[PDB]
């Protein structure tokens, strides 16, 4: 199955409430992880509500972070959208 979520929402979910990002067209909520993340919130929150796919890869994130990303999957970025 899929859950889907629209760019409308994904942009919106970006401000200390929910923080959503697109990593390979799947949609990833963190919000709590913002606390943990070595990269910090700000930078991530600013990539949030958009495609952070390239950026995520660019940083060369580890398997554990990748794994984490799987469990963070809430959603997908809608088809009408893309
Ligand atoms: C799915 C959400 C993500 C998770 C689970 C995650 C996890 C992590 C973890 C655990 C580290 C340490 C290095 C590693 O384990 O690879 C890290 C570092 C970092 N991340 Fe992320 N990250 C995520 C998304 C992002 C995104 C989209 C950005 C873009 C803002 C980003 C920017 C950074 C930066 C700047 C560092 C610092 C590199 C260092 O440790 O020196 N991360 N991340």
Swiss-Prot record:
From what organism does this protein derive? Bos taurus
Compartment annotation = Endoplasmic reticulum membrane; Microsome membrane
- Transmembrane helix listed as a keyword: yes
- Give yes or no: UniProt keyword Heme: yes
As stated in the Swiss-Prot or TrEMBL entry, residues carrying the post-translational modification N6-acetyllysine are: 3, 12
How does the entry describe its membrane topology?
Answer: Single-pass membrane protein
Q: Which GO terms describe its molecular function?
A: heme binding; metal ion binding
One GO CC annotation, please? endoplasmic reticulum membrane
Q: What is its main location?
A: endoplasmic reticulum
What is the protein's given name?
A: Cytochrome b5
Q: Which residues bind heme?
A: 37, 61
Q: What does this protein do?
A: Cytochrome b5 is a membrane-bound hemoprotein functioning as an electron carrier for several membrane-bound oxygenases.
Q: Which family does it belong to?
A: Belongs to the cytochrome b5 family.
Keywords (A to Z) from UniProt: Acetylation, Electron transport, Endoplasmic reticulum, Heme, Iron, Membrane, Metal-binding, Microsome, Transmembrane, Transmembrane helix, Transport
List each copy of the Cytochrome b5 heme-binding domain by range.
Answer: 2-78
């Amino acid at each position: 199955a899929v859950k889907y979520y629209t760019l409308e929402e994904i942009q919106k979910h970006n401000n200390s409430k929910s923080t959503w990002l697109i990593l390979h067209y799947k949609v990833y909520d963190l919000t709590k992880f913002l606390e943990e993340h070595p990269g910090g919130e700000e930078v991530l929150r600013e990539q949030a509500g958009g495609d952070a796919t390239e950026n995520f890869e660019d940083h060369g994130h580890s398997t554990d972070a990748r794994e984490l990303s799987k469990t963070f999957i809430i959603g997908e970025l809608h088809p009408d959208d893309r």
